[PDB]
Amino acid sequence: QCEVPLVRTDNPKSWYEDVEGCGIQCQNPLFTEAEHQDMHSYIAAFGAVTGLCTLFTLATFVADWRNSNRYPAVILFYVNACFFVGSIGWLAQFMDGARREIVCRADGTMRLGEPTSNETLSCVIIFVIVYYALMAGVVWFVVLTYAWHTSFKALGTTYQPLSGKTSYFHLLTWSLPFVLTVAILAVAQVDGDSVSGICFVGYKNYRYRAGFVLAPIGLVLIVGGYFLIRGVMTLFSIKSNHADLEDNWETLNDNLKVIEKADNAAQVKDALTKMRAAALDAQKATPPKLEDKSPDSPEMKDFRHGFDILVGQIDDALKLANEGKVKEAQAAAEQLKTTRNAYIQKYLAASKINETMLRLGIFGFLAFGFVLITFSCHFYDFFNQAEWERSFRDYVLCQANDCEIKNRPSLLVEKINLFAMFGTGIAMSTWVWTKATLLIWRRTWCR
Amino acid sequence: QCEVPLVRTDNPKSWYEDVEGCGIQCQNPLFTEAEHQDMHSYIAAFGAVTGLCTLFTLATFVADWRNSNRYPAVILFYVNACFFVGSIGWLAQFMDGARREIVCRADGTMRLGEPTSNETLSCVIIFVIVYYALMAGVVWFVVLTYAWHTSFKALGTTYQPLSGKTSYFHLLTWSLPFVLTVAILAVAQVDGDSVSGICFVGYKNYRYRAGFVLAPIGLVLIVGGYFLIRGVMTLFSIKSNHADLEDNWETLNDNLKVIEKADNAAQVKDALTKMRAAALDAQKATPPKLEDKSPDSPEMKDFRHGFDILVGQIDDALKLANEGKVKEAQAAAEQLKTTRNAYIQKYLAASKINETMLRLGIFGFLAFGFVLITFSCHFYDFFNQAEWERSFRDYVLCQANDCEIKNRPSLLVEKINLFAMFGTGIAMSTWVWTKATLLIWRRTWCR
Ligand SMILES: CN[C@H]1CC[C@H](N(Cc2cccc(-c3ccncc3)c2)C(=O)c2sc3c(F)ccc(F)c3c2Cl)CC1
Numbered sequence: 076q077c078e079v080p081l082v083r084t085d086n087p088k089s090w091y092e093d094v095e096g097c098g099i100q101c102q103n104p105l106f107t108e109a110e111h112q113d114m115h116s117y118i119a120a121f122g123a124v125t126g127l128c129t130l131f132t133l134a135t136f137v138a139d140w141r142n143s144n145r146y147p148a149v150i151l152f153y154v155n156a157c158f159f160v161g162s163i164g165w166l167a168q169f170m171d172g173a174r175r176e177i178v179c180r181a182d183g184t185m186r187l188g189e190p191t192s193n194e195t196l197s198c199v200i201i202f203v204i205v206y207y208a209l210m211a212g213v214v215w216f217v218v219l220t221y222a223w224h225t226s227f228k229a230l231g232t233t234y235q236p237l238s239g240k241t242s243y244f245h246l247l248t249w250s251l252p253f254v255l256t257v258a259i260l261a262v263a264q265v266d267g268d269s270v271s272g273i274c275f276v277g278y279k280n281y282r283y284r285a286g287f288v289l290a291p292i293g294l295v296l297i298v299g300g301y302f303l304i305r306g307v308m309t310l311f312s313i314k315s316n317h318a319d320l321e322d323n324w325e326t327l328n329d330n331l332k333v334i335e336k337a338d339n340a341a342q343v344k345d346a347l348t349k350m351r352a353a354a355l356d357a358q359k360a361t362p363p364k365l366e367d368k369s370p371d372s373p374e375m376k377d378f379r380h381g382f383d384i385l386v387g388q389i390d391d392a393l394k395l396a397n398e399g400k401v402k403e404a405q406a407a408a409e410q411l412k413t414t415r416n417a418y419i420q421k422y423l424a425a426s427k428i429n430e431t432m433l434r435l436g437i438f439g440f441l442a443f444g445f446v447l448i449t450f451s452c453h454f455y456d457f458f459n460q461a462e463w464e465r466s467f468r469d470y471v472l473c474q475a476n477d478c479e480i481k482n483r484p485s486l487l488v489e490k491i492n493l494f495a496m497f498g499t500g501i502a503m504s505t506w507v508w509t510k511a512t513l514l515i516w517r518r519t520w521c522r
Numbered sequence: 523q524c525e526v527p528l529v530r531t532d533n534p535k536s537w538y539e540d541v542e543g544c545g546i547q548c549q550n551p552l553f554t555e556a557e558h559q560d561m562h563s564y565i566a567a568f569g570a571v572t573g574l575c576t577l578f579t580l581a582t583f584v585a586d587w588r589n590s591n592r593y594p595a596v597i598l599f600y601v602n603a604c605f606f607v608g609s610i611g612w613l614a615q616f617m618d619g620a621r622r623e624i625v626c627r628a629d630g631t632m633r634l635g636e637p638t639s640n641e642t643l644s645c646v647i648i649f650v651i652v653y654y655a656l657m658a659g660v661v662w663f664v665v666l667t668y669a670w671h672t673s674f675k676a677l678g679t680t681y682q683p684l685s686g687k688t689s690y691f692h693l694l695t696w697s698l699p700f701v702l703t704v705a706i707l708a709v710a711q712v713d714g715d716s717v718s719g720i721c722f723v724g725y726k727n728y729r730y731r732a733g734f735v736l737a738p739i740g741l742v743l744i745v746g747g748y749f750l751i752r753g754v755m756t757l758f759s760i761k762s763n764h765a766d767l768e769d770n771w772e773t774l775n776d777n778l779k780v781i782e783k784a785d786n787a788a789q790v791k792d793a794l795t796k797m798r799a800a801a802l803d804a805q806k807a808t809p810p811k812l813e814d815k816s817p818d819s820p821e822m823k824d825f826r827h828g829f830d831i832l833v834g835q836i837d838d839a840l841k842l843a844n845e846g847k848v849k850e851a852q853a854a855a856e857q858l859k860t861t862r863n864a865y866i867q868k869y870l871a872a873s874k875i876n877e878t879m880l881r882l883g884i885f886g887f888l889a890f891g892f893v894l895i896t897f898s899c900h901f902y903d904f905f906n907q908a909e910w911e912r913s914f915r916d917y918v919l920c921q922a923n924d925c926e927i928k929n930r931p932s933l934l935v936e937k938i939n940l941f942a943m944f945g946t947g948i949a950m951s952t953w954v955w956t957k958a959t960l961l962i963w964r965r966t967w968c969r
Pocket residue numbers: 099103104105185187266267268271278279280453456460463464465467484489
């Protein structure tokens with residue numbers, strides 16, 4: 076009764092749209108057994124390398140677990156817990172005959188619109204594992220971006236430790252995936268794909284991937300991206316202003332030597348004007364210690380008021396540098412040394428950026444870019460599945476009488492997604508690739 | 523060609539499932555013109571009273587807008603901005619001929635699976651207005667629960683003002699509804715209901731309401747409910763312990779008078795044992811000032827160490843109260859006055875709960891309970907729409923040859939939902955129903 080790619084089945088749930096007794100064969104008709112075997116090689120490679128190196132990093136954190144429950148380590152721990160669980164789920168298709176168990180129905184058709192009764196749990200389990208670890212992973216990524224952003228604002232005793240926020244971090248990171256997963260199962264939109272060897276949301280009805288895949292991931296790129304940009308906004312404000320205020324102090328010092336060793340009134344004059352231009356450039360800046368303060372505060376007032384006195388004292392020294400009162404101008408500029416000390420020296424204070432915090436910023440922008448690729452690949456599949464579906468409907472009709480599949484999913488896009496998803500797990504596992512861990516695995520080698 | 527409830531239409535998008543040339547009539551076939559007219563009376567009543575009283579509260583906040591952008595007022599302002607915009611959307615069906623424009627198609631069938639081309643914007647606009655204000659409203663509700671929870675932890679100089687968090691509050695409250703709304707429009711699941719007179723997500727395909735209605739609202743009840751419970755956990759910890767530590771000081775004082783005015787050694791003995799039991803009961807408590815501290819800190823140590831000295835001094839006074847050394851026991855218990863002063867008097871410190879913060883807790887638990895009803899009503903419709911749908915399919919088949927609609931949506935449940943949704947807007951608008959606003963509308967009456 077049925078012709079390729081349809082298959083004989085007496086289950087009304089397995090039957091194809093309009094057609095009776097026939098349902099779509101389990102092995103993805105849009106891809107050849109060679110394309111499948113190749114894809115399964117890609118998944119096993121990236122999955123295996125992610126799985127054990129995330130396990131290594133997860134083992135490193137559990138070794139030093141007293142010192143690992145200390146921010147931002149505890150974040151990278153959970154980020155790893157998620158990519159490790161996601162790798163397990165993806166690596167389930169490799170167990171002897173497990174892929175057919177996950178992606179196929181009893182009657183040999185594709186496992187679609189799961190959960191269903193009379194069909195097994197193997198599909199929904201691998202979906203929950205992969206999807207729940209994914210959404211928990213991208214929400215732990217948001218936590219990471221927040222922590223990294225929080226490192227800059229807490230540059231003093233404005234200190235509200237992340238140690239207390241831990242209760243809200245574990246609220247969001249486990250309630251959000253739970254609610255989204257429960258919703259997917261309630262509407263039974265877990266579907267199997269043999270090239271993926273995994274069960275996932277809205278494979279078949281691509282419209283369920285908007286709300287459950289593109290909308291959560293889209294949101295984490297918004298909230299995550301906000302905290303990554305606001306942080307580098309502070310990193311570059313601090314690093315540039317300290318460098319600006321330093322270079323203005325240095326030219327001020329340079330000219331004070333040019334004045335001290337001046338053999339004429341013309342040199343003192345141009346050296347004081349250069350000092351005045353450097354004093355205004357320094358006034359038109361925020362000292363790193365006054366970054367978390369308002370651009371009109373009584374503290375920020377003292378900074379810019381000191382440069383008013385310095386410009387004022389420069390202007391008094393310029394009233395003597397125009398004529399032959401060089402000795403009276405150099406002695407005036409010598410009292411400029413004491414003003415520069417009482418109103419600039421204080422603002423050359425380092426405000427040294429912690430190595431752990433700067434490193435967290437490296438990981439945040441790497442986890443971002445990877446999730447950005449995931450979102451792009453998933454988005455691509457969303458906007459083109461209607462086409463792949465109608466090009467498939469035609470293949471079954473053509474073969475219900477030279478038959479081809481005109482449009483089809485891109486396998487480089489699927490491999491680019493899996494790279495940018497597994498590569499993240501490998502990237503976030505390189506957080507423990509430090510000297511301290513080499514010694515952590517040496518202090519446990521004996522003990 | 524078509525029989526009731528189907529209607530003649532040549533648009534393939536308007537046609538019913540399997541049937542050609544026939545599509546389902548716009549006026550909701552499951553409800554009578556009387557049931558409709560009644561429902562439109564309910565919506566106009568609750569909508570009109572919410573709409574103008576939210577507008578009043580929105581006008582009160584914009585009057586004192588300098589002092590209104592101060593937490594938690596700024597929250598209630600946006601909560602109101604949302605119920606006011608949602609009321610506008612709900613009240614659009616009352617404009618002369620607008621309901622048919624919103625809920626009907628050109629051909630007279632129900633407006634379903636919108637956005638579509640060749641059909642008008644009237645549907646999707648009213649959906650965005652109602653849905654975006656809803657999701658923004660329940661996320662502003664979460665912000666409210668967080669603010670109220672934050673009032674208790676910041677009981678000193680641990681002060682991290684909400685004034686700084688405002689940037690993250692406006693991140694979440696406008697990015698989350700935007701992403702969810704964009705997703706609904708991308709999968710075209712805006713549907714019209716004539717009894718509602720509004721366009722909304724997944725009216726027809728009830729499965730799209732899980733992810734876009736039950737999952738966001740479900741989440742806000744989780745995150746919102748967490749901050750409401752953790753706050754009352756602190757309100758009741760503080761109010762009970764201060765009362766516990768007060769009542770233990772009072773019985774200690776009571777017995778010190780019973781000792782001072784004792785005419786025998788037997789009275790001094792039972793009065794000191796009662797003082798010792800009250801001293802341990804007081805030791806087995808957390809002073810409100812030491813609530814945000816760890817139950818083993820060097821400060822919490824001093825508290826419980828003072829009661830060790832007091833019990834120690836009571837035990838020394840009990841060594842004299844057993845025999846006829848009454849005068850030597852009363853004088854020993856008189857030096858107990860000084861110990862009680864140096865180790866208990868400090869912990870009777872008020873730690874007075876701000877009236878604004880306690881009031882915010884009243885509104886948080888009211889907005890919660892209302893959203894809890896909304897979630898229950900929406901959940902009810904989700905689990906029963908498959909039934910109402912199959913009972914409808916039968917009505918069209920029966921009428922394609924005594925015909926009735928066996929199962930149908932509950933109109934008290936729809937009226938209970940609309941009450942618990944409009945009533946919230948009216949409840950959250952009663953935040954400005956204070957003396958200060960009566961004077962705010964008096965200081966603007968002239969000026
Ligand atoms: C997120 N990354 C994705 C990208 C796209 C991938 N994907 C989606 C999918 C999987 C399983 C079943 C159906 C499906 C569709 C329509 N009716 C029944 C089943 C659709 C596919 O490769 C396939 S299989 C397949 C099919 F059998 C019929 C029609 C299709 F158009 C089609 C497509 Cl598209 C999987 C991996």
